[PDB]
Design a protein around this ligand. Structure first.
Ligand SMILES: *[C@@H]1O[C@H](CO[C@@H]2O[C@@H](C)[C@@H](O)[C@@H](O)[C@@H]2O)[C@@H](O[C@@H]2O[C@H](CO)[C@@H](O[C@@H]3O[C@H](CO)[C@@H](O)[C@H](O)[C@@H]3O)[C@H](O)[C@H]2NC(C)=O)[C@H](O)[C@H]1NC(C)=O
Ligand SMILES: *[C@@H]1O[C@H](CO[C@@H]2O[C@@H](C)[C@@H](O)[C@@H](O)[C@@H]2O)[C@@H](O[C@@H]2O[C@H](CO)[C@@H](O[C@@H]3O[C@H](CO)[C@@H](O)[C@H](O)[C@@H]3O)[C@H](O)[C@H]2NC(C)=O)[C@H](O)[C@H]1NC(C)=O
Lengths: 349, 349
């Protein structure tokens, strides 16, 4: 049958556009967290009657929906350089006005709450979202996206606000209470609501139950370099985060990984010589029953060749954890199974 | 012989990139002035030993040279999102440190003075320039250019600082003390230092002496719509401004022009129906001996078709004046004759 789909379109990362400009990365600042600094994909949504359309990133690592407000205080706030949600053009709009305060490492986003029909992936969810009236100039003024759509759980929602997906489940009909992500090896990308597209995977899905109530995180049994397991011997966590673009781990663990690879460090990223790249061994993540491998081609891009792995010492609530970002999902088609509270993987195509 | 050339490359205007984003233009602010808001061309220069290269617009409407400083106060200033001039990497650098204060309608740019060899268009001028330590977030953070290079006169230089071209004349050898601008009908654009490229014009140049000491401004005898002269009957001024992209006049005069054209006003720009466009009559500017015509194709781009004419009530020192911007120069190859203090025009090709 005909699916329910959100297409993902390529956009320049706010880091990328800085390189195009020619910015010195080291002279920036040291940079309740997801920068979207290297996020390179977005979909569109509608908000309200007539739908006011917005470019948004879909982030399984957070549980709020927010867009810029028409009530941004002119030039002062730096949100006025995106599309703004005018409530006076929506008949379905419903007032709320409870202040909301999302804190990021680069700055504090402020705004108020609002209710309205959201059109997404060919369907209408009545959502409660944030109307932002103050924005951090640093990342967001360079952004090509207008806002954020959480695909996380109520537990990680500021204000205990029901996430667009909960609302999708409870109100109205999806076939199955799941959703999947898929990236092309490259306008390339697709979310499906209520299914997995068979054309974009092969073989069979394999599942790992989420280890804790309200987050898309799972137990990882070991990280293997070449043929032998290096770190995560006694078990660590793996956060599947569609808002993140790369794989990340604790600095403790990331040091180890790169030493074995023989990738000398740049203070910005980890790099290898472009000749030596293809030689680099396979990395494999031990998740549930199966071993999920990433070849050199998958995580590599005369001496200037940067890798798709980074370090992120994530704070202790979600805990020390790894982060399977977009780079993993590009090779491994992923299904988020809210009905059974598990994540499932298959080879992409 | 081999010329001395600065190639001009196309960049998205900070207005353009806002439209690509989808910004409401009316919800911005009302916007010692040239915004470069619709500027779409830049060249590169070097500054110092090893040349630190910068993307800059060449603006005959101003007489200062300035780039961003390595001493921008981190994230606070919003200049750190461009290339920065590090004085500690230049052997030719010479301290000055006299504060400089360029005022714009959107904000006040602050910085200090510095001396160094500038490499431009295949030659070295020792210049004194501005190192900017504070920048307006509004236009400049969206900019694709790093800085500005004045092609104006000492009179319109903040700090009475000698303009790169004066210095070019006095020190070292150009064949003739002139320079020309040329835009392709479209990476397209070229300045020549010390000559005019014969390949990019046809026929003979015709000249108009500058009417006052220190500005690229000239007497215009009349503005003709169709066959009959409408405004500037008793004579008005015409500022040839390479930093401006469009033609502009006093609002008094611009109202008149558009009424005769039958182009209904949008609060942002002046617009016409795309069917009706090609019908629009020829406009002709009466400068010196010859009549300089612009057909519909030259100033026009179902009902959405915006024109290349705008209104700018320029303050009374430079006076009520018109502004022949890049759109005029695209059809009419222009030579700036500093030796004889005149401007000369020819048909471009
Ligand atoms: C902004 O919206 C929040 C959240 O609202 C809830 O979801 C919306 C989509 C609608 O369906 C609302 O009807 C719904 O409340 C508002 O806060 C909530 O206020 C209600 C009362 O109006 C609180 O309910 C109470 O529950 C206790 C038992 O636990 C009863 O004893 C009380 O009598 C009462 O019914 C509820 O706790 C509260 N929820 C949260 C998360 O704070 C908020 O009022 C609203 N602000 C506005 C409209 O100005
Ligand atoms: C920053 O630079 C300015 C401008 O400097 C001038 O141009 C430079 C490229 C160099 O060639 C400099 O040598 C040159 O001065 C400085 O200001 C200038 O200071 C000089 C004195 O050092 C002033 O000259 C005076 O002229 C009068 C006569 O009119 C004599 O009686 C005096 O004895 C003296 O010679 C000059 O007026 C002044 N120019 C301006 C525009 O202000 C500035 O000092 C410098 N700051 C530094 C290095 O800290």
């Amino acid at each position: 049958t005909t699916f329910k789909r959100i297409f993902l379109k390529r956009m320049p990362s706010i880091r990328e556009s800085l390189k195009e400009r020619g910015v010195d990365m080291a002279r920036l600042g040291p940079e309740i967290l997801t920068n979207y600094m290297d996020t390179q994909y977005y979909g569109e949504i509608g908000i309200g009657t007539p739908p006011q359309t917005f470019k948004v990133v879909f982030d399984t690592g957070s549980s709020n929906v927010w867009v810029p407000s028409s009530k941004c205080s002119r030039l002062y706030t730096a949100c006025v350089y995106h599309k703004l949600f005018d409530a006076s053009d929506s008949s379905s709009y419903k007032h709320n006005g409870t202040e909301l305060t999302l804190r990021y490492s680069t700055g504090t986003v402020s705004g108020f709450l609002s209710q309205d029909i959201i059109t997404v992936g060919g369907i209408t969810v009545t959502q409660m979202f944030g109307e932002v009236t103050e924005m951090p100039a640093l990342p967001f003024m360079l952004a090509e996206f207008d806002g954020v759509v959480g695909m996380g759980f109520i537990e990680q929602a500021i204000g205990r606000v029901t996430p667009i997906f909960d609302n999708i489940i409870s109100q109205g009909v999806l076939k199955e209470d799941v959703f999947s992500f898929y990236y092309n090896r490259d306008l390339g990308g697709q979310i499906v609501l209520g299914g997995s597209d068979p054309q974009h995977y092969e073989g069979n899905f394999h599942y790992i139950n989420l280890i804790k109530t309200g987050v898309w995180q799972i137990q990882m049994k070991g990280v293997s370099v070449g043929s032998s397991t290096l770190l995560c011997e006694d078990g660590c966590l793996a956060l599947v985060d569609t808002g993140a673009s790369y794989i990340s781990g604790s600095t403790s663990s990331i040091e180890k990984l790169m030493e074995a690879l023989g990738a000398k460090k740049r203070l910005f990223d980890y790099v290898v010589k472009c000749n030596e790249g293809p030689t680099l061994p396979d990395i494999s993540f031990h998740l549930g029953g199966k071993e999920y491998t990433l070849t050199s081609a998958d995580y590599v891009f005369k001496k200037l060749c940067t890798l798709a792995i980074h370090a992120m010492d994530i704070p202790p609530p979600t805990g020390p954890t790894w982060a399977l970002g977009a780079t993993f999902i590009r090779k491994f088609y992923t299904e988020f199974d809210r009905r059974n509270n598990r994540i499932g993987f298959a080879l992409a195509r």
